[PDB]
């Protein structure tokens, strides 16, 4: 079934996060510019994952379901706006004393991860490996530096590196959960698939626009360019 | 010693090649445009590996050895021209009836691989992990799609996929050999290091300029851009 490809896609999600987190054991600390570059790469990957692997495939799905006119782009775009609105609804409904500021930063990481799991599941809802696999693989690529980054950031707020890595790994647990959810919401009816692809792309564009906010400027855009270029390459080859 | 980091860098070389080759077992055949994209990515990685990880570090090495004037850039540039001339000397001295055209294509792959092993060894000749590790890791990244590509190409000239993959893996054996050689030629005297960095960068720019020759045009430049962008990202983060 679809859940299968979605469950293994989420699984690669969690593994990749865990690998980055485990790399944090060696390093313990990293320069500000290297962390900025890593994040910029991760945002570039996500920005184009939602463009090339979610919106355009979503529009083509919608186009076969309802025809070539604006109805399809309307479905995809309304799903996308719904995804923005949902991530904006969380973030308000969700707050994010050292013990409590660690919890708020963890909530940030979990709210971040929710859309990416969802996107993996949504991409594997038609069983289409030519939509799930490049998406999923981009998600996992950028999960590595982000697990690294997450664990280091938690060490930096005051945790011993071991707890920091343990919490990063647990964080990565949110990808398969979101994969189950994305495979849920995208199977109830025909339009559920392109609606869900819009919705996933929108949620990701929101977490990026809300976390691209973090000198340390020229370095993060080299990363963003790299991560965006690499995605285009993945879309073409896969 | 330096040979240690060089031997493990070469080792990652061979492993990566083998992983791409093993992936060819599943696929057996691939579209022309996906193979072109893969190669374009591999050329972009190499082009910037020789720029950002060989020439500029080579110039800085040369600059500390002989001073900031043109003497350093002269050493690096003369090494680079020597590397072009050496790869041009091979290719003439080296030819590259199905059984014999497979051997000529294998010779092509071995002549291709020689500079990359050398570059790994040259990058680890000062023991400087900030020069070897990003270089080495770029070499291994692009060894994966190139093992894939090599094995598929050999299947396509008429080999059974099993022999094709076996020969691709064996091919990847040339990276640690070249790592030993690059760690040799770069240790005999002080200038040997920046001379060798020029030489490695030049040999690679030659094999790229000689194999970038292969419609199927717009797709390979998406790959080249991606592979070049990714290298910049690696140079910055590592």
Numbering used by the authors:
A (entry chain A), B (entry chain A): 54 to 149, 162 to 279, 285 to 308
Structure paper excerpt:
ZIPs represent the only identified zinc importers in mammals, providing metal transfer from the extracellular space or from internal storage vesicles to the cytoplasm. Together, they form two separate helix bundles encompassing TM1, TM4, TM5, and TM6 and TM2, TM3, TM7, and TM8, respectively.
Overall, the metal-bound and metal-free structures are reminiscent, each displaying an inward-open configuration of TM1 to TM8. The metal-free and metal-bound conformations represent the structures determined here, while the outward-open state is a generated model. Bound Cd2+ ions are shown as purple spheres. The transport domain includes the central ion-binding region (M1 and M2 in metal-bound structure of BbZIP) for which the electrostatic potential is highly negative in the absence of zinc. In the inward-open metal-bound state, release of the ion from the metal-binding region is mediated through zinc-binding residues, including D144, H275, and E276. Release is facilitated by the TM2, TM3, and TM7 bowl, lined by the invariant D144 and H275, and E276, as also demonstrated by our metal-bound and metal-free structures. To investigate zinc-dependent movement of the transport domain, we aligned the metal-free and metal-bound structures using the static scaffold domains. The analysis reveals a considerable displacement of the transport domain, with the ion-free form being shifted around 3 Å toward the intracellular inside, combined with a substantial twist that tilts the domain 11°. Minimization of these distances through stepwise translation of the transport domain across the membrane suggests that an 8 Å rearrangement toward the extracellular side is necessary, relative to the metal-bound inward-facing state.
